Scaffold this motif. Structure first.
Motif, PDB file in Angstrom:
ATOM      1  N   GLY A 131      12.816 -12.974-107.989  1.00 38.88           N
ATOM      2  CA  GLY A 131      14.205 -13.322-108.272  1.00 38.88           C
ATOM      3  C   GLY A 131      15.207 -12.436-107.560  1.00 38.88           C
ATOM      4  N   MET A 132      14.908 -11.120-107.484  1.00 36.90           N
ATOM      5  CA  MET A 132      15.724 -10.091-106.829  1.00 36.90           C
ATOM      6  C   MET A 132      15.900 -10.391-105.332  1.00 36.90           C
ATOM      7  N   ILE A 133      14.815 -10.838-104.663  1.00 36.63           N
ATOM      8  CA  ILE A 133      14.808 -11.193-103.239  1.00 36.63           C
ATOM      9  C   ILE A 133      15.657 -12.456-103.008  1.00 36.63           C
ATOM     10  N   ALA A 242      19.120  -4.745-107.340  1.00 37.67           N
ATOM     11  CA  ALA A 242      17.825  -4.066-107.408  1.00 37.67           C
ATOM     12  C   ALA A 242      17.715  -3.107-108.603  1.00 37.67           C
ATOM     13  N   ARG A 243      18.866  -2.668-109.152  1.00 33.20           N
ATOM     14  CA  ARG A 243      18.945  -1.769-110.306  1.00 33.20           C
ATOM     15  C   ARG A 243      18.508  -2.468-111.598  1.00 33.20           C
ATOM     16  N   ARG A 244      18.787  -3.782-111.716  1.00 25.79           N
ATOM     17  CA  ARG A 244      18.415  -4.593-112.878  1.00 25.79           C
ATOM     18  C   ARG A 244      17.028  -5.246-112.745  1.00 25.79           C
ATOM     19  N   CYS A 245      16.326  -4.983-111.623  1.00 26.78           N
ATOM     20  CA  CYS A 245      14.984  -5.502-111.359  1.00 26.78           C
ATOM     21  C   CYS A 245      13.957  -4.739-112.201  1.00 26.78           C
ATOM     22  N   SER A 246      13.247  -5.461-113.086  1.00 31.57           N
ATOM     23  CA  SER A 246      12.248  -4.886-113.987  1.00 31.57           C
ATOM     24  C   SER A 246      10.819  -5.180-113.533  1.00 31.57           C
ATOM     25  N   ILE A 247      10.017  -4.113-113.352  1.00 32.91           N
ATOM     26  CA  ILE A 247       8.610  -4.200-112.944  1.00 32.91           C
ATOM     27  C   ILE A 247       7.748  -3.589-114.067  1.00 32.91           C
ATOM     28  N   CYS A 291       7.251   0.039-105.551  1.00 33.24           N
ATOM     29  CA  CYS A 291       6.910  -1.231-104.900  1.00 33.24           C
ATOM     30  C   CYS A 291       7.627  -1.445-103.560  1.00 33.24           C
ATOM     31  N   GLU A 292       7.098  -2.377-102.739  1.00 35.31           N
ATOM     32  CA  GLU A 292       7.591  -2.740-101.406  1.00 35.31           C
ATOM     33  C   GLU A 292       9.017  -3.311-101.416  1.00 35.31           C
ATOM     34  N   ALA A 293       9.298  -4.275-102.319  1.00 35.73           N
ATOM     35  CA  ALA A 293      10.594  -4.954-102.454  1.00 35.73           C
ATOM     36  C   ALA A 293      11.763  -4.008-102.752  1.00 35.73           C
ATOM     37  N   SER A 323      14.049 -12.416 -95.201  1.00 33.00           N
ATOM     38  CA  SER A 323      13.268 -13.642 -95.006  1.00 33.00           C
ATOM     39  C   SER A 323      11.785 -13.322 -94.795  1.00 33.00           C
ATOM     40  N   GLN A 324      11.490 -12.185 -94.135  1.00 35.85           N
ATOM     41  CA  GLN A 324      10.130 -11.701 -93.882  1.00 35.85           C
ATOM     42  C   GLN A 324       9.523 -11.144 -95.174  1.00 35.85           C
ATOM     43  N   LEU A 325      10.360 -10.492 -96.011  1.00 38.07           N
ATOM     44  CA  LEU A 325       9.977  -9.903 -97.296  1.00 38.07           C
ATOM     45  C   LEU A 325       9.669 -10.986 -98.339  1.00 38.07           C
ATOM     46  N   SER A 326      10.405 -12.117 -98.298  1.00 32.11           N
ATOM     47  CA  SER A 326      10.224 -13.251 -99.210  1.00 32.11           C
ATOM     48  C   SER A 326       8.905 -13.987 -98.954  1.00 32.11           C
ATOM     49  N   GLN A 327       8.459 -14.023 -97.681  1.00 38.82           N
ATOM     50  CA  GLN A 327       7.218 -14.668 -97.238  1.00 38.82           C
ATOM     51  C   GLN A 327       5.954 -13.952 -97.741  1.00 38.82           C
ATOM     52  N   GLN A 328       6.083 -12.666 -98.128  1.00 35.84           N
ATOM     53  CA  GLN A 328       4.997 -11.827 -98.641  1.00 35.84           C
ATOM     54  C   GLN A 328       4.509 -12.304-100.016  1.00 35.84           C
ATOM     55  N   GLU A 329       5.433 -12.817-100.856  1.00 37.45           N
ATOM     56  CA  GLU A 329       5.136 -13.320-102.202  1.00 37.45           C
ATOM     57  C   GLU A 329       5.445 -14.824-102.378  1.00 37.45           C
ATOM     58  N   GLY A 330       5.669 -15.523-101.265  1.00 36.35           N
ATOM     59  CA  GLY A 330       5.964 -16.951-101.250  1.00 36.35           C
ATOM     60  C   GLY A 330       7.447 -17.261-101.227  1.00 36.35           C
TER      61      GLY A 330
END
Ligand code: ZOP
Length: 330
Positions: A131-133, A242-247, A291-293, A323-330
């Motif tokens: 969602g963050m991407i 990215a601050r509100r991104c929860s992993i 993480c990478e993202a 666009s390259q980063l989004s392709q890593q997880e679909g």
């Protein structure tokens, strides 16, 4: 407008048309005078946003005051006579002037989004890695289309936002961002080297202002300086996403940039002491290196917060990397 025609059908009539411009002047006048106002949704620096309904379907209406005619025309001219209809740009519908004099009604019609602005969405919800991407890619693709100039009459001139913030960026139903409020924006044509506005004074929110703008070192003759100023403002927006991104539960509370260094509604002199004098930038936490993202987003942020304008990344470069980063997880 004939019987049975809906707002969803009208969007197709202007997007897939020969010319990528807005609906006809007579059609635009008909839509605005048919919209049934439901309730006041919000307010900004110019006019008041209201929730309207055209033939049952939900729509957004911005009612401008008679005094702020400059803000109404600037937004209407930028949304119409350019050809800019993009997925990551606010879907404009109509612009109309009802009365004359002191009681002049200035209307601006666009697409309605239930989630609202990025400021209201992030303060209420917590985003996922995928969602963050999606939010970052759309914001990067949006400004990439604005800065893109197509030469040959049929194309579009290069437009700089000048005031980029979380409040100005709206989020769609499918979790996609769209750039809104082009009242303070500036058009530019490379074929003749001319800019429509009067460049001499500072514009937009002080919190999202570039250091070059704050200490008056910005070359207002150069259009690239305005383009690079939007990149720094986009980087501040990228910091809060990215601050509100929860992993796995780990996430930070939503706060505006320089919340610990500047208070609510700051002055020009107060913001200059933090950004220009002390060279302080928003804090990037240690958990972002996991993480990478989160790590890629932090690399772009520092490459957008440069003291020098020319050293900063381009709108198409941020779009291509995401666009390259989004392709890593679909
Ligand atoms: C062409 C000129 N116009 C109309 C705009 O630029 C414009 C401005 C604003 C909006 C909009 C278009 N479309 C919307 O859906 C807009 C807005 N949508 C909106 C819709 C619903 C809410 C309620 N919100 C409350 C907080 C939790 C999530 C739900 C808040 C904002 C809006 C209105 C005022 C301030 C910020 C966002």
């Amino acid at each position: 407008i004939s019987e049975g025609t809906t707002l969803k059908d009208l969007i197709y009539d202007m997007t897939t048309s020969g010319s990528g411009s807005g609906l006809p002047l007579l059609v635009q006048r008909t839509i605005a005078r048919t919209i049934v106002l439901q309730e006041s949704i919000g307010k900004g620096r110019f006019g008041e946003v209201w929730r309207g309904k055209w033939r049952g379907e939900e729509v957004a209406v911005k009612i401008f005051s008679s005094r702020e005619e400059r803000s109404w025309f600037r937004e209407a001219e930028i949304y119409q006579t350019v050809m800019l209809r993009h997925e990551n740009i606010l879907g404009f519908i109509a612009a109309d002037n009802k009365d004359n004099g002191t009681w002049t009604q200035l209307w601006l019609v666009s697409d309605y989004h239930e989630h609202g602005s990025l400021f209201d969405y992030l303060n209420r919800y917590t985003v996922t890695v995928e969602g963050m991407i999606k939010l970052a890619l759309s914001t990067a693709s949006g400004l990439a289309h604005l800065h893109m100039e197509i030469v040959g009459t049929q194309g579009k001139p290069a437009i700089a936002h000048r005031d980029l913030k979380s409040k100005n960026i709206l989020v769609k139903k499918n979790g996609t961002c769209c750039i809104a409020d082009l009242g303070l924006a500036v058009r530019h044509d490379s074929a003749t080297d001319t800019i429509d506005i009067a460049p001499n004074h500072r514009v937009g929110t002080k919190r999202y202002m570039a250091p070059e703008v704050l200490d008056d070192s910005i070359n207002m003759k150069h259009f690239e300086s305005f383009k690079r100023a939007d990149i720094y403002a986009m980087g501040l927006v990228f910091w809060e996403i990215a601050r509100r991104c929860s992993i796995g539960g780990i996430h930070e509370d939503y706060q505006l940039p320089y919340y610990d260094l500047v208070p609510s509604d700051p002055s020009v002199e107060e913001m200059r002491k933090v950004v220009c004098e002390q060279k302080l930038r928003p804090n990037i936490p240690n958990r972002w290196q996991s993480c990478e993202a989160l790590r890629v987003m932090a690399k772009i942020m520092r490459e957008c917060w440069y003291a020098n304008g020319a050293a900063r990344l381009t709108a198409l470069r941020i779009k291509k990397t995401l666009s390259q980063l989004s392709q890593q997880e679909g």
